[model samples]
Target chain A: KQMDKPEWKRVPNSEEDVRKCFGPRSVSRNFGDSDLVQHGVEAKHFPTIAELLPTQAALAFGSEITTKESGEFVEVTYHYVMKVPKTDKNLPRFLEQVSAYS
Target chain B: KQMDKPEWKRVPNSEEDVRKCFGPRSVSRNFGDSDLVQHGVEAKHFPTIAELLPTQAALAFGSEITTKESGEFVEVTYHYVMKVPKTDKNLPRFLEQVSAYSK
Candidate 1:
């Protein structure tokens, strides 16, 4: 662990800057996409998500990251954080859709 | 090596979503921040930065990342990228100021 902070390139500050740096995806002047994460709004900007997304007792919906070692496969870590509503009847299949971190 | 794209949480679509997801950091309703990297704008949103920022032959200036071992110094990497004007007279000290990656 180095005690000092390593220099990091700060992301520039504009919609244009973001566009130039990372190619623009589907961007709306106001809201961007339709693939909504059910309870995503509640989890945004929380500094960290480990504690925010999942509920211990309630089995609404959840996601988590599972990191794999580099071997035959490129060891990539999947980081998932999502919030699913508790009442949806289709919850079972939707959970199956994202059913990995269960 | 996973060929399949692993599940990932995507960033929300609003200026507010960006704000909420990554806490508001002096975002300009139109622009943000004052200390612009001499060549930074030329780099952002690029899938990667190793190629976009500076010219190899031109001695304008450069920045690079060096990583170290874990225990001794935290092994943190310093990733720097920028664009600076080529003919600026103070190139020496400014290079000294940010004088990391050089000719």
Candidate 2:
């Protein structure tokens, strides 16, 4: 239901796409409270760099993929540097909407 | 060990304290990848508005305590609006340190 609106739509699906849409250095950033990294939400559904994008207003500055050995499991860590554009006047409500999910 | 540093110390303990420390409207804000709301970190230890103060660099503006019934469980939601000060030069490294901990 949250993804039904147009503002929620059009999330970039790859690192290149994120860069293409935002900028070559665009990366996704997070705050202390965000459902994107919390439990209940399926991380697998967001396999690419873009699914992590919660709002189009979020600026993706840069990103990197690191493969680390976690005991027997290989952990792939996606690190993105980002920020929210102050130009996004509706970002506050969007955040509260995001927090309501989980 | 991370809390051993001075920057991690001096966290305000209550909503009044948050206001006294920052401003009346200082609500803590977060991004899509912050670990404060993530798992492993004990929310109970952070029972008050202060413990949630990850960095003194964080700005606590406003808060509300909501009581909701989830099945038989009574959930008390502490909705805090916050933001990080760009003046904090060390905030990036602090965030990375927080993400490393889990229960």
Candidate 3:
């Protein structure tokens, strides 16, 4: 049997979500074509961050969370990956950077 | 009325999805915690790519399709934004990157 992957569905960033992750800094209200936002990627897609990316790679930008422990409960907060660049040129620039890295 | 934002729901990237996306190249089967896949961000998020980002910014990497005219219907491929880094350091590195960009 073939395994099915989850689709990347569109969702809105609420005030709570943004505040929790990005803090209480006022973001831009005027949205554009290349809308900048962080992709909270699930942590089941790669082997190693360094291996998947170059140290100073431009296109591949952002951070990650391996494991988190709060008292007795242990939560895996590895879903977060990178803050994507919302634009036309850098968008392609990212592809180039990935190509160079690979 | 306050507009409600959609949540970033988790979905699987099947063969068809991945093939249509990252090409025919075989991706890793043994998935790690920090999965390295493109965010495919929607367009209604930023003002300008360059303005929001600094030159040589590390945390933000990606692409965009402004307007795709598939015959009569006009489709916006602006949903795609960047390929995210999947790892322990990167998870926070992204936050830091945003701090630098925003701050």
Candidate 4:
């Protein structure tokens, strides 16, 4: 429920969006001294790129299916050069309300 | 032994470091069509921030030790805001070579 609001979709990149939506960072009064490991939040805890992306999954396997059809298949190549870590834990927080069509 | 040259120390961050140390990517003759899963290379298969960093390890472990001393202990605080992934496997590559230092 951190970034869950209907107005968040209204003006995403606006100055009012940032100010009205979020506030300053502050620590909770009900916290204690603790190591970050006990929280179970780490980079390597997420799924690998092969497991998440089906294309990578296919390449990691032995995918051998080439076609020579002129009008049937259009060849397209996509390259993923950068790999960023998934640091957030909340999955269902990103709602599907902005794009208007979907 | 791609980036294993003594010149890598002399001219660090120079144009030679990029050209002389590495070459263009090319396809191997003995490779076949295969899914990338079996290659055993991914982002998640790395040590996390708390696991690799000693400071994060100390904080995540819930250590309770604070002291106020005169010239006994110097206190310093570090804030870790951004988390970048270790995309490369080379750990021992960045070592002491320049700056007139030796071990």
RMSD value for candidate 2: 17.8
Residue B37 in candidate 3, Cα distance off native in Å = 14
**Which DockQ values do the candidates obtain, in the order shown?**
0.02, 0.02, 0.03, 0.02
Better of 2 and 3 by lDDT: 2
lDDT of 4 at B29: 12
Model 2, residue B89: what's the lDDT? 46
Q: Which stretches of candidate 4 lie over 4 Å from their true place?
A: A1-102, B1-51, B54-66, B71-90, B94-100
Clash count for candidate 1 is 16
Q: Which stretches of candidate 2 lie over 4 Å from their true place?
A: A1-61, A97-102, B1-103
Where is the poorest 10-residue window by lDDT in model 3 chain B? B1-10
lDDT of each: 0.22, 0.26, 0.24, 0.20
Q: Residues A1-102, candidate 2, lDDT per residue (tens digit)?
A: 322312112233232232222222211222213222331123232223122232211111011223344454333232323243433353344344232323
Task: Please give, as one word, the docking class of candidate 2.
Answer: incorrect
Docking model 3 quality class: incorrect
**lDDT over C-alpha atoms for residue B15 of model 4:** 30
Instruction: Predict model 2's lDDT versus the native.
Output: 0.26
Over the stretch B9-95, how does candidate 4's per-residue lDDT look in tens digits?
121123332223222112211111111112212223212211221222212111121212224322211121112123323211211
**Model 4 lDDT tens row, A1-102:** 313532212221222322232221123111111211122122232122112122222121111212122343322111111121233232112111111111
lDDT for model 1, please.
0.22
By lDDT, the better pick of 1 and 3 is: 3
Interface DockQ of candidate 1: 0.02
- Runs of candidate 3 with Cα error greater than 4 angstroms are A1-17, A20-22, A25-65, A79-102, B1-103
The CAPRI quality class of candidate 1 comes to incorrect
